[PDB]
Design a binder for this molecule. Sequence first.
Ligand SMILES: [Xe]
Ligand SMILES: [Xe]
Lengths: 302, 302, 302, 302
Amino acid sequence: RQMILAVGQQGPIARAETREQVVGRLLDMLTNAASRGVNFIVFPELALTTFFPRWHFTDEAELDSFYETEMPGPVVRPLFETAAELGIGFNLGYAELVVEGGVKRRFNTSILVDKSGKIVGKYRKIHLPGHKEYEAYRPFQHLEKRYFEPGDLGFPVYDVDAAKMGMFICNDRRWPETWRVMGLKGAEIICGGYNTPTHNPPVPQHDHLTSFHHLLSMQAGSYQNGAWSAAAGKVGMEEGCMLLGHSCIVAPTGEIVALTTTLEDEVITAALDLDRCRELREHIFNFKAHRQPQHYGLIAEF
Amino acid sequence: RQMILAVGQQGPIARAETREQVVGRLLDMLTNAASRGVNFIVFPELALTTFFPRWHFTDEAELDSFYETEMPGPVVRPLFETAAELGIGFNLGYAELVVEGGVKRRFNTSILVDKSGKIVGKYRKIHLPGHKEYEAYRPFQHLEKRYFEPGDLGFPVYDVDAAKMGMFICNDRRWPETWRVMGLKGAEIICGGYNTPTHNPPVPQHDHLTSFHHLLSMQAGSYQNGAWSAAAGKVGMEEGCMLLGHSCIVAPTGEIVALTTTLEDEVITAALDLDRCRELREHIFNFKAHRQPQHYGLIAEF
Amino acid sequence: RQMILAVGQQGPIARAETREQVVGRLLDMLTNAASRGVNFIVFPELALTTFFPRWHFTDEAELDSFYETEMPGPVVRPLFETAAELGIGFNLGYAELVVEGGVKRRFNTSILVDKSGKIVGKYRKIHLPGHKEYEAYRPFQHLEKRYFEPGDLGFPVYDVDAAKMGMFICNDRRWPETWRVMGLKGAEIICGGYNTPTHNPPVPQHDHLTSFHHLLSMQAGSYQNGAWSAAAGKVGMEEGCMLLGHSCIVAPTGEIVALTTTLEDEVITAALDLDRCRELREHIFNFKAHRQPQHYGLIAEF
Amino acid sequence: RQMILAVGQQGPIARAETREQVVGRLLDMLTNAASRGVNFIVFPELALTTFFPRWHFTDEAELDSFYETEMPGPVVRPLFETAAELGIGFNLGYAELVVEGGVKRRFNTSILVDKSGKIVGKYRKIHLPGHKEYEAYRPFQHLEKRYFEPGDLGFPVYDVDAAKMGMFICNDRRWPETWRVMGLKGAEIICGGYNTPTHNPPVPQHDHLTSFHHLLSMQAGSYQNGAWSAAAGKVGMEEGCMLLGHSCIVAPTGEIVALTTTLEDEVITAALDLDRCRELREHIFNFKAHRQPQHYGLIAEF
Ligand SMILES: [Xe]
Ligand SMILES: [Xe]
């Protein structure tokens, strides 16, 4: 019931930095994690490449090179190998390209890999942020709705070694429903990655609130569902776009218990007691005692 | 589209203090609000009496004296008369007793009164915190489940002068569902009152997080639905129980724009621009664009 | 002993925008203040012009036109006349040019004007941020050390109507010495303006902390000296440079009691009770009971 | 220059819990620390016994029994032996009793012990909080001024293995002067321990800000001097008095990087890069470039 959770924040991944170069950066973090008694580490969203949805692509082949067609392929394999021989689980985000009867499905995906190196769960991003068309005035695009489709796995919770773990991806953390669906399935840890620019072209009047909104989302989510949470950023200046840092780990009371302070590759860690979830879920947010779903119907109407 | 919103926090209300004496304290806060240009003021939950759910009543007549059988009665009419003279809307919380079909219904209620002095809408607390039977191992009782039954009006949003306003009551502001049903109805302002002790007998290890949790709830709710909000506390040491202060007014971005600093009757105000809601709702939380209600059905299961 | 204090935040002042146009904006904030019961309003640093220290100047006369030689001149007079007509006091920031003994002295200055329109006191910025020579790596210079010389008035505290008021200017708020010198002179209100860019050329890894460090400074300084404080930003996108919003009013406990949420001209207000300073200064920070100046001599060495 | 720093918070220490028992608890935290790669661990103020200044003592022998006459004694020795075996330095707080020509001196002290087990520095509390004579209404007393005299070593900074470290004890963290004296001496880490009740009898209206004021002091102190910091609480319900938790580690930007979330013995850790102090100290708070001590003379008047 007690474990050490970590977050492996990434600094920038350049457009032509290789997957072999990224994996090497991930392995060094696993190594750092293992010297600090870590048992599970969270890596960022789209952790194997630069954040490619910042450009408008005119070439499908070029677009497809940023997606994984297997997991892991030969180059990502050492990550898996290293993490199991260290006996450390991990959450990895990546772009997923699958071919169904000749039709190409694209997803922004994350997976949970237990301490033995078994993939025990997958999640695909349901809330895809940004815009649809190329928008000339932006200094950088945000075309996730063009490069991915909404996930089709719902928000699942999985058994990973001792814990019940749910996943979120980036913008999903901002929606109370993401958290609540996994809270209703008894997640003890909700975790995921993000790439969050500190400039937003259509509403630049919120730019100086980027960290505030990120942390607000993580603290409320955890508190409302009594779940430990963790958010691992890919951060700093990547291809000219400044990505938010403040990767974090948060208690079931919404307290931030660990926080990064660099914009580089950085491992933060926190001791997690999975029975601490009880302080909320057996008390103020004891859902059978207090929740009232018969009056929340509008939320699930579509 | 622009208004000055206030919160009229109350300091304690002794069990012996009369409704006439309380009403005189509410009047003095409307005079203050008038002096600062206020157009609408939010008063606390159960604002006419001490917080009677802290005791276990055996005398049903004694329990009934804390309820209102009409709104306003004679004792509460001067509040209505003076607010309608000054042109100020208000939100008032009070304990309501209504007989229907052979049942004496008891509800923890709030109403919205417009600047003409008309009662435009009611809400009756849906999430009742605490417990139903006397519990000897707690130092003070929290018998809201025994003295009230959950509201039967859903979470409605009403036009009040120029604004779409929704109400919550106390513990409701902790549940993201509360805010999201009203957000989906296009509430611009969401407001209500509270009595929140700073000591929680069953989980006293969260007592120094009382203010944190209260503010976290208001900030995240406002942010997620792009709504201004306001919470009016009844605060300080009331009958030997300390109630949290930190009454507040919050912008649509989650920023706290006004906060009380005393534990006495105290008026705080803020400038509200109802078009600021679009900064979130036509953008990051543009629901038609990004919300995914098709994957949230677990939230509404009962 | 009780008043309503206001902050008058300015959005951007263009390079071609006139002193007459900038005074009409100030005047509109004064009347918005008067409708909300305000007795004193704080305006930003260098409130009459754009923030000219972002540029390297070659033509002295060109530089000199940004400075005041009189306070007020014919164009700034109506601000003083209207403020005294409404009976509101104000803090105004502006660039001052004084020729004395063959030396052209340039100061970044602020004045207190009481409700009757009397200039009661001046302060000249002591801590000038930035650099003294043009530096090539910045999109905007920060030449305060070239365009100004450090103030020669110390950190004075003045009587202004009922209150003991001290002034700071911009970066001064970051030094605990600023606040403490005024606290040791009894200041009850410490106030001043700022122009703070949300990008810091030499340590851009702290840009997402801009609001955090501005508010941290204001809360700590207030708390430590048991003083109300107020900071008025000149904010938003100015001449290509984005300046931080979050103008604020803070209580003697360090609580933020009012905060701006727009990057445009905006008035915020708060009730101030000059006797609340005692909660801190007769108790935890009772300087005669607890301060130990015998061990602080290194702070004053030079 | 890189290290793993920790805080060993303590849960309650009963009046008759023996030093052997406390030492045993300390040893358990050192094991935990070692498993997380820690190099240095900070323990609380007065970490060997219950917080004995809460009571009125009338017997000298009774008071004396809570003081160390040697450091370490036999019972405390195994803390030093294990720490040194593990290669972990530590900061320990304890009550010091020394007899100088028949006169008893009493200090509330803390020592820095390097990874070899050598005591390399001591500090004695300079700002003793609380009242000087018994005050009947208080539920618990705060008689530090009676049981200790103010320290006589000023605020020293010492070399501890790779690092420059300064100490503070409890209420000392609230005075900007504590932090500034050690920042002016180059401290890279400023650390120390505390016992902070969440109820304050004379000003109970700040009790819901107890965590707020603690963290604010820590964040502000660190940010202004460019130092990593750490505060180690002895927390929870000790002899009927609830002590604040929220032990923390803080970066030189004032960001909290590690926070405790229980009110029991707990170890938190953070990676520290002693070269990070430069982000502030070479730039915004470049003392040589920016500070003006010539106008800070009132701070040192006495
Ligand atoms: Xe929700
Ligand atoms: Xe200071």
